[PDB]
Copies of this chain bind each other. A is one copy, B any other.
Amino acid sequence: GMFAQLVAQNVLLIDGPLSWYSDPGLAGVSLTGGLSYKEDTKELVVAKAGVYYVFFQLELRRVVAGEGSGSVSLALHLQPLRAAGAAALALTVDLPPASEARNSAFGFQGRLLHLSAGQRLGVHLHTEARARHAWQLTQGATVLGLFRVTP
């Protein structure tokens, strides 16, 4: 087929681009057909042009008790810019206040995107820092995926 799924390496909440596990021996990871990962630029590279369902998942875990609040965002950016500062897919998850047993936070978003040949997909993580040491990415749960819909 024509699909891919990547699992984020990052655990700490640092403003900047996410790195991705891209080896299909890893669980939760797939690359098939004309899809590949540039380790240097941290980009998912699409070989054949078409319409894809693209989704990303974001899960956070409280790691210091009774501490940490704020907001965390993911933003998918295309390259080449298929306008200015175009965010093809964007997800914000609110971190509940420091309370009775709300130690996790989930986000899922999906849509159909038209993607060109050689289109590069990268994901920027932004965090509204409020004790960003008290929260961390849940490992094996921040996922970027896509599969081709166009036959």
Residues of A within 8 A of B (CB): 1, 3, 5, 27-28, 30, 32, 51, 53, 55, 57, 69-71, 82-83, 86, 90-94, 96, 100-102, 104, 106-112, 114, 128, 130, 141, 143, 145, 147, 149-151
Contacts and interface: CB of A to CB of B under 8 A. Distances in A.
A1 B51 contact: yes
Chain copies in the assembled complex: 3
Given A1-B149, A3-B149, A82-B27, A143 B92 contact: no
B112 A5 contact: yes
Nearest to A96: B94
For the residues of A in contact with B, the DSSP-based class is strand
B112 A91 contact: no
